[PDB]
Amino acid sequence: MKFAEHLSAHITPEWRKQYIQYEAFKDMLYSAQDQAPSVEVTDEDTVKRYFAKFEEKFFQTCEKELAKINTFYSEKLAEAQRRFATLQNELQSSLDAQKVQHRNIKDLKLAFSEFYLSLILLQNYQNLNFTGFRKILKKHDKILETSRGADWRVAHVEVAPFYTCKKINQLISETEAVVTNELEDGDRQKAMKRLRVPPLGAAQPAPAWTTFRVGLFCGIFIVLNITLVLAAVFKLETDRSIWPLIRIYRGGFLLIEFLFLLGINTYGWRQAGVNHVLIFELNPRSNLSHQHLFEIAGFLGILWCLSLLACFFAPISVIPTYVYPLALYGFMVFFLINPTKTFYYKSRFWLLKLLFRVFTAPFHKVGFADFWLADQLNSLSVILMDLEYMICFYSLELKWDESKGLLPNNSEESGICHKYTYGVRAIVQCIPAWLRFIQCLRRYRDTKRAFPHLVNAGKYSTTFFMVTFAALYSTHKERGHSDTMVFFYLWIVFYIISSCYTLIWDLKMDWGLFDKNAGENTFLREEIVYPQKAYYYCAIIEDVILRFAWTIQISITSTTLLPHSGDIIATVFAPLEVFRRFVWNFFRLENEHLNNCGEFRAVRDISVA
């Protein structure tokens, strides 16, 4: 494949309908060729008229395509001219006001670098549309053994006001002159370093070293997982309680799984066309492909596996076993808050600036990155409970004056910090629900709109109530007082309500499925971005199952019996919840991008002042 894939890869995602449609032309050509009636059986007038009809139809289709291209190009050119006019007026106003100002200059820099991107994208649009006409007309010449295609090219294509309009190059030169004289006072090197746009989209291949580091961290991870399984089967002795260990190491595994599935999500968004760079407001020139997230996940998983192995084997006799989890989590934290400029600095600091804006929610106007991150925390809720458990274990239970403190004796009676001590577990549970609830309240206050925000605030109020009733029921049963089974009934009804609330919001308002304009894609949206239709139905069924995950647990719990269970339930259902979030990310991002596809948004429209 040479140009079909080259076109589907170098195409702007939001302008997919305004392109040349190479595939339809090719399929029309091939169908017309294969349906030649007979080379010698029927009359030559028959085949001649058949080929003439095909010629007419093909050139009418090509003419309507060219008209579409011309209209879209003139539209985008007028839009860019108006944007340049308003940007220059604002720059002149600010420069005159010169005689905080740093924020002003920095947002005019950002607005100019975003206006350059639209110009470059329009230029590439022109280029690809021209060298898709030449390719398809060359194919028509070769397939029909005629030369009318090149004549049609030189007669129609190279007169059109989309290949002869040399206005974008002048606009690019003027933008560069403006940014160099005004914003940088000379120094075109620094101006162009900000304005330049690398080959972007699905067309940029990650460097070979990043792929090799992925393949290295993944092989080590596989072998270390095999070794962990073998050592757990053959080395971990009985008479000790493994539950503290895997309860501490449960959070790290969920984080590794989340980073892996986020890498897969980024790959899916990059290939399908859903551009997360515009929705997350990332830098269109510097991003993180799936390889970077795969590498981060592999490195942190290597550290996790090494810490768990050291816990099992106890390599050095002087260091007690409880130092390895502490060291692992301290390295995970020190990796994030690394003050130097190494090891994914811009990414980690963007993530930290976002985490500061989600954990102090009602004070910042929320965008997509902080709304998206606060929804991912609902799935990574066992990580917060793992941190709480680890802190309570190291502060109240871990006997420091003994080596094998991580695995105490079998005589390990209830051992507080394992349950609802005083309600702290319920609060750590409701923390991300509280974040999203107050964020939706801030959205209602800001937009004054009510439907999408006031609803979607009860979605997390139901989690509030469900966790409250869980806490009440378990703390009543642990004290064996009266009114217990009532708080089982209320737990049941509020989990029913929570799952029904989140399920209809996952499908209808988050994913956009089940709309009246479905058309041929029954039970789906109008326009589907992901290739196969089977992905959506399987996703629907999996979200139905993984949102009602408490059915299986309350069954197993009701089966009860002696084995420790609730914890086995949580350990099996936490990666299932992270996988549910991984599935939900795809279709949330797709629904978000499909709205940017209607207004043809390729840039962020950076505000000013």
Side-chain angles (χ1 to χ4, degrees):
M1 59 312 283
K2 292 193 206 315
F3 189 72
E5 190 60 15
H6 173 50
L7 178 63
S8 278
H10 291 237
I11 189 178
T12 298
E14 296 89 339
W15 308 348
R16 175 166 300 279
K17 186 54 56 63
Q18 273 78 3
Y19 265 68
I20 185 54
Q21 308 278 359
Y22 201 58
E23 292 269 12
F25 275 142
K26 194 198 315 184
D27 278 348
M28 166 156 40
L29 248 59
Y30 282 165
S31 89
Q33 190 192 220
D34 267 298
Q35 301 305 325
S38 82
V39 308
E40 91 284 47
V41 194
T42 74
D43 186 280
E44 47 86 23
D45 163 72
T46 78
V47 287
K48 273 294 301 313
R49 189 189 294 103
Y50 169 69
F51 268 131
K53 280 166 44 60
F54 171 53
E55 204 58 74
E56 308 276 0
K57 185 182 67 178
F58 180 77
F59 284 160
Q60 301 275 11
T61 319
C62 183
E63 202 144 327
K64 84 190 303 300
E65 291 271 358
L66 174 60
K68 166 176 75 173
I69 301 285
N70 275 347
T71 44
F72 185 60
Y73 171 73
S74 174
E75 181 177 342
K76 303 308 282 185
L77 176 59
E79 185 194 29
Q81 290 209 55
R82 295 194 270 98
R83 178 90 179 100
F84 184 61
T86 174
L87 212 44
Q88 214 165 14
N89 280 66
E90 167 210 330
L91 164 64
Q92 174 54 40
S93 161
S94 160
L95 204 53
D96 196 351
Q98 172 58 80
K99 200 45 70 192
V100 84
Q101 205 269 352
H102 190 82
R103 278 220 43 81
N104 226 321
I105 210 66
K106 183 178 179 180
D107 181 65
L108 289 135
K109 284 192 191 308
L110 180 53
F112 266 128
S113 168
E114 210 61 30
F115 166 62
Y116 198 91
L117 195 69
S118 291
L119 299 176
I120 294 298
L121 292 176
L122 198 52
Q123 207 190 234
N124 289 12
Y125 172 89
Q126 297 181 246
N127 288 350
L128 279 179
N129 282 318
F130 171 61
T131 191
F133 269 112
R134 201 195 93 251
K135 298 291 187 67
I136 195 57
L137 288 175
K138 173 181 57 67
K139 254 188 160 177
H140 163 255
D141 280 355
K142 189 185 60 173
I143 286 291
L144 268 54
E145 288 63 33
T146 171
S147 167
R148 193 175 169 177
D151 311 328
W152 194 86
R153 185 161 62 78
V154 295
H156 293 35
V157 171
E158 272 146 9
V159 80
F162 99 102
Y163 182 67
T164 198
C165 182
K166 300 299 199 314
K167 213 90 61 59
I168 295 296
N169 307 283
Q170 292 200 204
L171 275 185
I172 288 183
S173 178
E174 287 183 32
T175 298
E176 287 170 359
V178 162
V179 189
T180 316
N181 298 341
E182 262 84 35
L183 298 184
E184 319 296 331
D185 195 349
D187 194 6
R188 200 162 167 274
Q189 208 282 332
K190 196 167 303 307
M192 200 73 46
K193 197 199 62 183
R194 174 176 295 108
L195 265 60
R196 194 177 297 285
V197 63
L200 70 163
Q204 49 156 32
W209 275 117
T210 300
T211 317
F212 166 70
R213 284 198 291 267
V214 174
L216 168 63
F217 291 155
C218 275
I220 303 182
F221 189 59
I222 287 181
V223 178
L224 285 179
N225 268 7
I226 304 285
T227 301
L228 272 178
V229 174
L230 264 307
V233 175
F234 288 133
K235 175 85 172 185
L236 179 49
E237 81 298 324
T238 171
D239 191 13
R240 310 307 276 241
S241 45
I242 195 191
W243 296 119
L245 180 61
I246 85 170
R247 208 173 294 155
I248 290 173
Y249 280 86
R250 190 170 54 202
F253 178 63
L254 299 189
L255 198 62
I256 304 318
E257 187 195 22
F258 178 64
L259 283 168
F260 263 107
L261 299 179
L262 215 57
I264 295 188
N265 274 333
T266 298
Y267 169 79
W269 300 334
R270 190 166 309 274
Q271 298 300 327
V274 188
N275 58 332
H276 56 293
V277 290
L278 167 61
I279 304 177
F280 285 174
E281 290 194 349
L282 303 187
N283 226 25
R285 308 153 214 271
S286 86
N287 291 308
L288 264 75
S289 41
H290 43 280
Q291 260 98 29
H292 299 61
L293 272 74
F294 281 140
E295 160 189 351
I296 296 182
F299 183 56
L300 300 180
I302 280 184
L303 297 182
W304 181 79
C305 275
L306 284 182
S307 184
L308 192 49
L309 265 187
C311 276
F312 283 145
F313 282 118
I316 315 181
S317 44
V318 62
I319 44 185
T321 36
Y322 49 75
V323 174
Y324 302 116
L326 229 45
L328 168 63
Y329 285 84
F331 199 101
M332 278 187 178
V333 166
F334 174 77
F335 175 74
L336 196 66
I337 61 182
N338 209 340
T340 178
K341 294 206 169 188
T342 78
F343 288 10
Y344 300 116
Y345 171 65
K346 315 205 75 59
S347 295
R348 290 176 308 103
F349 256 49
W350 179 78
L351 181 60
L352 281 182
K353 225 180 297 298
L354 194 62
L355 279 172
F356 173 56
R357 296 206 277 101
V358 305
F359 278 112
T360 75
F363 295 118
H364 307 74
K365 177 181 68 63
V366 312
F368 197 95
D370 61 356
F371 142 72
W372 177 80
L373 191 47
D375 224 297
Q376 309 288 303
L377 292 184
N378 287 347
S379 304
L380 309 172
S381 171
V382 175
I383 297 183
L384 268 68
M385 297 174 64
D386 269 25
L387 275 66
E388 202 271 344
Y389 182 82
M390 177 198 317
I391 291 174
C392 205
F393 180 87
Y394 282 55
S395 198
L396 280 179
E397 198 289 327
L398 177 61
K399 296 183 315 316
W400 296 80
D401 54 36
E402 177 277 347
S403 168
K404 315 184 321 162
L406 253 199
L407 320 174
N409 42 334
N410 61 49
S411 62
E412 176 37 37
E413 290 58 30
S414 88
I416 194 54
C417 310
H418 178 24
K419 47 199 62 48
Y420 306 147
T421 78
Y422 267 123
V424 186
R425 275 284 201 78
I427 296 183
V428 189
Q429 266 267 18
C430 304
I431 275 288
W434 162 264
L435 293 185
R436 263 303 278 158
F437 170 65
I438 192 67
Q439 275 195 202
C440 297
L441 283 188
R442 172 55 186 257
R443 277 272 290 283
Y444 164 81
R445 216 274 307 183
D446 230 355
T447 303
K448 312 316 303 299
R449 198 115 49 77
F451 172 51
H453 306 136
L454 213 48
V455 196
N456 195 193
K459 207 175 79 167
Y460 312 104
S461 200
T462 319
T463 300
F464 283 12
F465 287 142
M466 166 186 50
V467 178
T468 296
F469 278 156
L472 282 185
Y473 175 73
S474 191
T475 203
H476 266 220
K477 184 194 60 53
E478 190 39 45
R479 283 164 310 91
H481 287 54
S482 318
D483 305 67
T484 319
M485 192 62 36
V486 194
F487 288 161
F488 167 80
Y489 263 50
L490 263 305
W491 158 261
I492 288 294
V493 58
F494 264 101
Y495 217 141
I496 279 189
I497 289 185
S498 197
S499 308
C500 272
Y501 212 133
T502 42
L503 190 49
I504 65 180
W505 193 275
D506 275 336
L507 307 180
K508 265 293 301 180
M509 282 280 275
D510 272 4
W511 292 2
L513 311 178
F514 296 152
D515 61 61
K516 49 194 53 53
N517 304 340
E520 317 295 332
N521 316 311
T522 301
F523 294 115
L524 291 202
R525 224 174 301 101
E526 173 50 274
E527 180 175 350
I528 45 188
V529 180
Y530 300 118
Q532 299 297 333
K533 284 198 318 163
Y535 296 151
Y536 291 76
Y537 301 120
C538 304
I540 290 177
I541 302 180
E542 159 269 345
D543 201 293
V544 172
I545 297 176
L546 290 190
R547 194 61 92 171
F548 273 101
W550 57 297
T551 60
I552 309 91
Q553 78 208 11
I554 203 62
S555 184
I556 308 303
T557 193
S558 62
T559 71
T560 59
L561 295 174
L562 63 93
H564 312 69
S565 314
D567 280 346
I568 301 191
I569 294 169
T571 314
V572 189
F573 285 164
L576 260 47
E577 171 64 30
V578 179
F579 177 70
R580 190 197 72 73
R581 191 53 65 167
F582 154 66
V583 173
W584 175 97
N585 274 335
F586 274 137
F587 305 91
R588 182 53 164 112
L589 261 297
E590 160 182 270
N591 188 25
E592 197 73 25
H593 152 64
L594 279 179
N595 296 347
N596 297 342
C597 203
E599 41 179 336
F600 312 122
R601 279 243 326 277
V603 301
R604 299 110 60 91
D605 182 353
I606 294 312
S607 159
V608 290

